Symmetry: D2
Subunit: 314 residues, 4 copies
């Protein structure tokens, strides 16, 4: 029997007071968008309680911010499942129409579910964000879209990516940065250029991004075995490239998690010496995101049901 | 050069009211930067290094950055030499450039170097040179400026996968897809990102990201990409059917003669210049000194680039002798 | 008394009466007011109605902080040039965040508490923005005393310039972005268009207060004295200046609308709420 | 001008003002100084002129701004000339009432009178700063000038009632009575760069700026003490303030100013080490600007006929 290692995290575990209402509202939005073809797919999303992830990762934001962020999470889950998760060339050639919409240079066709929804989200983000904040978000979305071609490339040649390549690319394949980009926007504040881009702030963002990607890899491993051999998963990557048992691969992912937490706490102590209020709120945002994501992933029907009944949990 | 049309082509004029200037350090820095490129071992062939020497890449750096001090010009000239060498050897090359999956899978080691997360291998000429340039930019730029440059480089690298995607299935991109992607496949934004750095100043978040500044930057980027497409068309017929070229795209998708394709590129250039002058008038009403300096930077870049493209051995020699110039 | 037309929205913070009571209790606890009659006058004045009408969008905690600051200003206004100038360095020391205040000055103790509470919800740049406006307001008081000391009515040009800083309006404009939980960047705040709108709004509030409250430091008196006008003609010229400033505000706002970021738009709506809310409170 | 022997009847020892900051001078010092002195002559602000010439104001500009290009040094040199002339040339009530016309010129709401030498010059300098600075940078400078002008009323208030100000009041007010902040406001402008709001206003950067401002004011007070004895009993001078309020001999007051100097240097180095952990390149250039200002000011003041000449012949120099 497999033992899932614990994912210790000293960060506060909180949830937005608007979780229940906004989750239902954002799910209804997703259903109305026609981004998902199957009624069964719509129901699987509903059961996953995507709005619980939104509320746990953004526990401080006002209701209208949570709703906007929840709609964005729903777009990403839908897009990730429907577009991304065969042939790198076909998928690369599909991107420019979407990039046109993202740059606001073209009206989507009436039949383009993903384009119509992305246009609406860009407009709604633009209503509550500065041009710098909008571009910050847009840049992260573009990197995410192009990162999906890299996943398609690995599937096309039927290779498990190497640890070095995977850990680098996992930071942008997961879209976590596109959600970090809405922390200040969601809270109604705005980090200045040298606040946002400060090496300490970037380092904490990168470690938070690693933690969320790796934590999802550990907990989503079981359901990913059912889809292209869990190719894009640190458990599969370490098992394959270090010739580990599944149990030892799970433990190595837990080790990398613990080491990233240690690295986060160290850099945070340095940042604490100089950080302004806006930077402190953003870093607390990263902490809520990492901890809220673990709470969500351990409890979501998206991940839990795929684990065999005899799997042990900490 | 062998003629590729039934009757001589007339290269249309590329009118531009922007000042045409050259950095006073052009001659000395061109030679210094070329020596740096040769010393880097990024280019394997002596013949390749010689064709780069003949192209006078430092003339492009000096014309596009005419105001910057010598140390700035040298750094920017080294960056242009990196881009020319990399674009020719990697992006448009036989091994990586003809399959989306191969090019995509080759990027992560380079991205690692770009993020300052890894020492290049002693034999990785492109990686060692990129690490050196990252460090030299970091010496004279704020973290926001370095990240801005790094972001434009990542956008450029990812964009190359799309070019490879087109080569792989042997298709000419449609006009709408090509004009969108041509703004990021050409690395022009990575050079715009060094205008404030080069001049010793720094646009703040809302200056850089202001819709008016982004619009002028996008129009400048269009002009440079299309102007390069017009003048590099002849040399590009010799590699991959000039697939990534507005002339090929319009000729193919609108069923135009090459002469009519060239004229439609010139019309698009004239439209972009008119759009630039219109948006510049709006920006003039609010622009701070740093924003005005950056926009003058865009104007110098567009005009200096036309002068380079009309005069560089990289482009001129591939045109048949019966080609009429503007 | 001529009308003061104003196309800016008239709104009130829903927390007006709850926070007015809380803030008045805070003022009574501060001992900044000596007389029981003065404390009762302040209670009945509903200073929190001015705070709520001039800051109608801010959350309750922001309204409470701003209401306490208005109470500090009104108390400080209620309580010669040389004496005034020499009284400032101890307030400045508290303001600088350089030393804890003595039990000795009620104004110092409360100013320190407000600085701490502003620092808790503002960036260092925002705190320094507010500090600068408070210093200018304090130094501006000396100028008023200078005129009183030699029994002079100030000239129109001197009065209109100094009236912008004698009234402390800029100290309240400095808490608009803070109160709303956002922050204008240096080049947003200091853009000539944003400074011009800030200055026109400050002009309007000062001139509106002068006219509605109508003595030596009053635009009606200044114009009547220096332009040899009847009281009625002085009142009308003040109303004309008001209408000209409103017109100037709308035209400059139209120019700003071309380029303004969302934070700048929110701030400018803040100026509009302040001008209109001030008139609503005064009437 | 001065005495052979001490006004105390014992030779006075001027304590050293130790400082590990590099002493540098702008390569354009001599040329720009002459040009700036010409400018001042042409302004008609001086009606004094010969002592300024001998004082070599341009040497202070060049020592305090050693890295800036020639055009920046010239602008800064003209501004120093404006300040030295104004401090010399300029009752609390009369002084307070003289400020608004100057404030109007500063805020562009008024043209100066054809006869207003100081207003005409201030207008020209504002426009020349505006030519090479962002609106935020111009407002930074404008704000420090206003604070400087208002601070002169506090000096007039003490003079009017004949009070020596207390150490706590004087030390606070000395940071704005001296106009030092108006010169710090041109460090980034002079260098062709610009600190962001949260760079400029960071507590570490404000602390270093305030300590640098303290150092320059106290160092000037120590070295200008003899000259200021001949002007309103050296009322506005830390030596007078400490001697009066802490019941010190003048010799012990000089030594206490040097102790405060050494304490401020130590505090600067400690805070600079903390700032080193986060500082961006523009912040590092500005902080190096503060160091050059403090050190260049000591070099200038110790060698200046403006200060050295007033001390008795038996004074013991460091
Ligand atoms: C893009 C997306 C799916 C969701 C958006 C919300 C989000 C950033 C969640 C954090 C978890 C992880 C990085 C999601 C993407 O990985 P992966 O594709 O392995 O997600 P899965 O394990 O749920 O399938
Ligand atoms: C990236 C590079 C090659 C040069 C760096 C300098 C630069 C941004 C030049 C502007 C011209 C054009 C956008 C070059 C890339 O396209 P293309 O591959 O069509 O250039 P080519 O026509 O010279 O081959
Ligand atoms: C304002 C002025 C005089 C010059 C501008 C240059 C400047 C800021 C010099 C630093 C030294 C000191 C603060 C001068 C003002 O004090 P004080 O009036 O005691 O100077 P003094 O000792 O030269 O008379
Ligand atoms: Mg997925
Ligand atoms: Mg995925
Ligand atoms: Mg997963
Ligand atoms: Mg290319
Ligand atoms: Mg090429
Ligand atoms: Mg080309
Ligand atoms: Mg003085
Ligand atoms: Mg002195
Ligand atoms: Na700010
Ligand atoms: Na000011
Ligand atoms: Na700025």
């Amino acid at each position: 029997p497999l033992h899932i290692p614990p994912l210790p995290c000293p960060f506060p575990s909180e949830i937005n007071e608007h979780a229940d209402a906004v989750d239902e509202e954002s799910h209804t939005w997703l259903a109305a968008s026609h981004m998902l073809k199957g009624a069964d797919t719509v129901e699987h999303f509903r059961r996953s309680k995507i709005g619980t992830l939104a509320a746990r990762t953004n526990p401080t934001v006002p209701r209208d911010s949570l709703r906007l962020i929840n709609d964005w999470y729903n777009w990403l889950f839908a897009f990730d499942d429907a577009f991304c998760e065969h042939r790198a060339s076909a998928l690369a050639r599909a991107l420019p129409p979407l990039l046109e919409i993202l740059d606001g240079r073209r009206e989507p066709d009436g039949s383009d579910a993903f384009g119509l929804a992305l246009k609406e989200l860009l407009h709604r983000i633009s209503d509550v964000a500065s041009p710098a904040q909008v571009d910050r978000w847009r840049t992260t979305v573009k990197e995410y879209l192009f990162a999906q071609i890299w996943e398609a490339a690995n599937r096309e040649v039927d290779l498990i990516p190497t640890p070095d390549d995977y850990v680098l690319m996992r930071r942008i394949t997961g879209a976590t940065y596109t959600c970090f980009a809405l922390i200040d926007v969601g809270g109604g504040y705005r980090l200045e250029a040298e606040e946002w881009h400060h090496p300490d702030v970037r380092t904490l963002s990168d470690l938070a991004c690693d933690l969320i990607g790796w934590d999802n890899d550990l907990l989503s491993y079981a359901k990913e075995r059912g889809n292209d051999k869990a190719r894009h998963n640190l458990v599969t990557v370490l098992a394959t490239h270090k010739s580990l048992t599944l149990q030892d691969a799970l433990l190595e992912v837990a080790q990398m998690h613990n080491d990233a937490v240690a690295a986060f706490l160290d850099r945070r102590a340095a940042l604490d010496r100089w950080a302004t209020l806006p930077v402190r709120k953003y870093v607390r945002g990263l902490e809520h995101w990492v901890r809220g994501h673990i709470a969500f992933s351990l409890g979501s029907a998206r991940y839990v049901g795929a684990w065999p009944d005899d799997t042990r949990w900490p």
